[PDB]
């Protein structure tokens, strides 16, 4: 079985075209990326305090 990754056709009604124009002019997806980064700032980092803390190992 196989899937299509980029086989969508954008709608050409007035509402869809207006939505795409609003995206182009007001930079909505750029704001979405900014929001993702902003949210990702307010979470705890993954850094450990070497050499006072050490990475996990195995026997």
């Amino acid at each position: 079985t196989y899937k299509f990754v980029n086989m969508r056709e954008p709608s050409m009604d007035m509402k869809s075209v207006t939505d795409r124009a609003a995206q182009t002019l007001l930079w909505t997806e750029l704001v979405r990326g900014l929001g993702m980064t902003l949210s990702y700032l307010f979470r705890e980092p993954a850094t450990i305090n070497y050499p006072f803390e050490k990475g996990p190992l195995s026997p």
């Binding site: 509402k15 207006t18 939505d19 795409r20 124009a21 609003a22 995206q23 007001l26 909505t28 979405r32």
Partner: protein, 71 residues
């Protein structure tokens, strides 16, 4: 005596794992966004209308005072 003991999945298997793409749509129409922009523009225009007319009156008053002092 002891039976075999090695790394095996628990009985009944593991819990289902999500793999589908999850890109939710936040939700706000382009008409609504344009309406918000136009509304804030109009509100700013009206406020600055009022303030600039008041500033014109203040400047006229200052000019009146200067005219009175000139001779």
């Amino acid at each position: 005596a002891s039976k075999v003991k090695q790394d095996m999945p628990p009985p009944g298997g593991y819990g289902p794992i999500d793999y589908k793409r999850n890109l939710p749509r936040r939700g706000l129409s382009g008409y609504s966004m344009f309406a918000v922009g136009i509304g804030t523009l109009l509100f700013g225009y009206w406020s600055m209308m009022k303030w600039n007319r008041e500033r014109r009156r203040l400047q006229i008053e200052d000019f009146e005072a200067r005219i009175a002092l000139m001779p």
